[PDB]
């Protein structure tokens, strides 16, 4: 029985509101998670692909013996994350998550601010044409934070790259899982969306595969 | 003029625990002066008091015969907004935006600060850092409505060292920037300096801010 | 397989240092070993640091894909430019330069490190072996090739050492189109064995690139 | 005044360039002047984005205060190397490096430039003059200072192309101890009037340093 998702995100990207709220569900056994979220203040101003990446490291798989401490953590208090992205162009976009859960459910309220973009910036085009995947190092910094970092790039129409650096913060209630704690090398977190997007309407399926080493 | 009152409102989160100051004081732009004062509302700060200095109102810089200080000029011309990202060499980044209100003789500061990634043994958990050191910003427009800061600022520690950072901040303004600043002439310098009073509940600063060209 | 003959000349906080030596590899099995030895006596700082610094020809790269390092031999090579940046201040630069003979590969490198501060843990025996790591590979256009990693150290008290690596590739003919024509990132995972001492180092590396981990 | 003699050796995106010159600086006066040719022909990116690499030796420092790179003259001199990142992508990778003669300094200067891309300023003619910084200089113990600074270039039809600069300068001896006695940053306020063409590159640059403005 995948676990059912809410969200919502608020947040301003240079100094414009927006709000969406939707949800769809996991199966963390599979990697897999879907999202649907509405715009509750009409069409976006910025190009939706941005969001994607906004729109639950609990759906991901961890390689045997391993837990998911994401998912450890439902029971234990929970974590946050906090990122900073620096685009290419100069913007950046600062976003917190935090997380309830409920019976069978996870809700996710995140906030999102988002700066510096310049006005020819290809977030405000329609060139954007996909996220591609991602390889995230992660490693504890101390018994309840571990650090992420990762490169980012999207994809545009005619060809080309609009890329970012991510660095993540996860600060954890309770001590992060012994698997991961105890490792004595880093894990790392591959993860790939494929997206449906309108100004409006944003959808999403992303998949996370977490290895010590790959296949 | 007679001094402009300020008020103050600092609400933030360092590495998940929440703080919240309050407080106020009154600046002279033309003297380059301002003041603030401000007293936890969360009890005793588990961080160094000394890192929230510079988030504790560039309208109180002199600026140079023939310029006019831009953030000044902005409050009868529907202002702007700051948002820094400060990365420091341990590691930890501050995320801090800067709101602001205006009514006739009178500044109000609603300021939110997000601080993570600092380590266990950082400095800032301890009382090392003994002072704030003065710093110069270099300023210059992104077209007519955004400024971009830069500026590296260093704390000394009670042992003779140092505690660096470098500080990136995009100023975005709802009207075209004072023309002083946009004709194509290169930046403008702001140096800054304060006179730190601090204890773990009661925090207290004398900013002194002068912009030039050259010096 | 190939032949591999190697030298490394640099300076760390001004201390010049050179080091010589080679091994041999086999890209179809993404390995490759490099045996070198100081000639100017005893390192100054952490043989570790040099790992990652002792040929991009001998990775794997999935089906479909053909390694442009590798294939760049017969076409004008490439050079590699890094910039390491540790989390105590060091920098890094590094430059990767090769000439090719028959059934064997000659890098001449250059390395030029500053801003490591007295406590730095490369001046201690605190590192004990390298972590592995996954870099990010994009194409810049048909002759360039941009790469970001996070490197980490393993320190003898169960600790990290951090850094973070840009590298930018230079190709003299343009990149092989199974990467120009892929549309996303290729990543590259690597991995060392290290036998060092401070005059005479040695790896085993292996690198395996991949578009999906499974 | 003392002479300058000036080697700069470099590639940029792999293109190999190199320039010799010199000319003369005034430490008191905080000024000095070089000129330098191409010895490989016309360069192949802007003839600005060399000016800052075209010798703190020549900088004033307030009353009471020694500039610590003329110091060092006489006791083993200093290195500086510079890690430069603009704003699209591209970095310069900058080594200094000095040798004193009666009246004389000598530089042979590398610069490592990779990652621009194809349709960077640095490739047009766009790029009319470098402005004026202000350097952040801190001690990191008693042989080496950190710099920092933000510089500009400014664009034929307006606006700006930007990026970081961070330095790291080792001194085979002690800092001057006005330096390290200091208790927080000096400031190195520079700039410079260029007159350059694709072959012939000049500077005079003014360089003063100070604790307030």
Sequence with gaps: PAMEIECRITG???????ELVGGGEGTPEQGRMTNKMKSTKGALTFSPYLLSHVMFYHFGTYPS?????????????????????????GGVLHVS???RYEAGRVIGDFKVMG?????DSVIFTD??????????????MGDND???????????????????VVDSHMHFKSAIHPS??????????????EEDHSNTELGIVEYQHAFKTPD
């Design 12 to 18: 301003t990207l240079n100094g414009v509101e927006f």
């Design 97 to 99: 998550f935090s997380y």
């Design 127 to 140: 060139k954007i044409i996909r996220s591609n995947a991602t390889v995230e190092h992660l490693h504890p």
């Design 115 to 119: 700066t510096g973009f310049p006005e």
């Design 180 to 193: 991961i704690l105890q490792n004595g090398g880093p894990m790392f977190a591959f993860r790939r969306v």
């Design 146 to 164: 571990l650090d992420g970092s990762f490169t980012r790039t999207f994809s545009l129409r005619d060809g080309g790259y609009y890329s970012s």
């Design 65 to 89: 013996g391993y837990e998911n401490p994401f998912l450890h953590a439902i029971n234990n208090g929970g974590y946050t994350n906090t990122r900073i992205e620096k685009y290419e162009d």
